[PDB]
Amino acid sequence: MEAKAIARYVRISPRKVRLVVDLIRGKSLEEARNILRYTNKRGAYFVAKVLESAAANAVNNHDMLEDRLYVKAAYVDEGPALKRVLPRARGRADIIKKRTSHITVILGEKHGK
């Protein structure tokens, strides 16, 4: 049995946030909790929020037992891009993309036999 939370349309760049997701993958939820608080990146916040919403979803929904949990799977996909004009010298005008992330934490019960 396994539980999952997915944040969608998070306004952040995937490359940036995908980096801290790497940081906690296959970790017991208790270390994963520890790391993200003391990891210095903006995307630590957002990921911890998903981790949690998936911890809750474990015990409260799928009958999981919190102290047995670790991170089975996790990843961030790329939602649609916010495109804004950025005006430039000699009247040029580029377009910057404010990118968007779909964050996914998947939880599992450590074998705990």
Partner 1 sequence: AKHPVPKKKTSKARRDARRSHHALTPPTLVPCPECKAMKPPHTVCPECGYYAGRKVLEV
Instruction: From 48-56, 64-72, 82-90, 105-113, give the range in contact with Mg ion by CB under 5 A.
Output: 82-90
Chain positions 77 to 96 lying near RNA, rule: CB under 7 A, are: 77-82, 84, 86, 91, 94-96
Contacts of 67 (CB under 8 A, 6+ apart): 30
Give me the DSSP letters along 75-105. EEEEEEEEEEEE--GGG--EEEEEEEEEEEE
How many residues interact with RNA (rule CB under 7 A)?
Answer: 50
3-state secondary structure of 23: helix
Closest CB to Mg ion among residues 73, 111:
73
Contact residue for partner 1 among 11, 26, 34, 73 (CB under 8 A): 34
